[PDB]
Amino acid sequence: SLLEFGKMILEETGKLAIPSYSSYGCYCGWGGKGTPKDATDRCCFVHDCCYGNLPDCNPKSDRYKYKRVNGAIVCEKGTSCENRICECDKAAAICFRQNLNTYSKKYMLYPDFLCKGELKC
Template identity: 60%
Template sequence: LKVLILLVPLLAGILEVKANLLQFGIMIRATTGKSAFPHYSTYGCYCGIGGKGDPVDATDSCCKTHDCCYEKLRECNTKTDRYRFRTQCEKRICECDKAAAICFRDNLKSTYHLKYAYYPNWLCKGASPDC
């Protein structure tokens, strides 16, 4: 019982850290019918952590645009702030995520391709487009 009492706050902290990413994943699933992992978490040159070079297609460009949207929110905790709509940051993060999810949906049939789902970073060439 003592171990459980100690683990509950720890687990709550871990869940808080990933809260926004989980919400974004739920939004992607609701909008596209695909789960964020594995379909978008490592897609192309910009979906997932980091990003460089030319986007491989319009779906990857959605991720580049999302990265740029987050870049404008430097004063916000884009990975951890949840959509509670109590602050401008929470609202703006949700708007960035919503725009990306809609972009994914709009490009699902025209450009999404499984060959880019686990795209190796070393294949990402060219100058990174400016935001």
């Protein structure tokens, strides 16, 4: 759920999910349209697609367990949905960390009309 995801992001990047990643670019936030603005926005695009492969699950509210094994994120065994949700989030946290160097404040609170184009999962 958003509770585990936010904790994961904070630990990984040092940034608070809200408002660092909740209204960033075209995909980090509600829905998404157009072409991702940068690497960080691409992370959210892929994350959005990852959740999209889980029709019957509820990523926003289903809680999973995870632990750190010397920095590494390890998803604990739970329900099938919980395991898959955790893997989606873990990937996003790592992706955000790998692209922290290009994170740009000009993409915070990005205007909707500037999101134009198409990109399929």
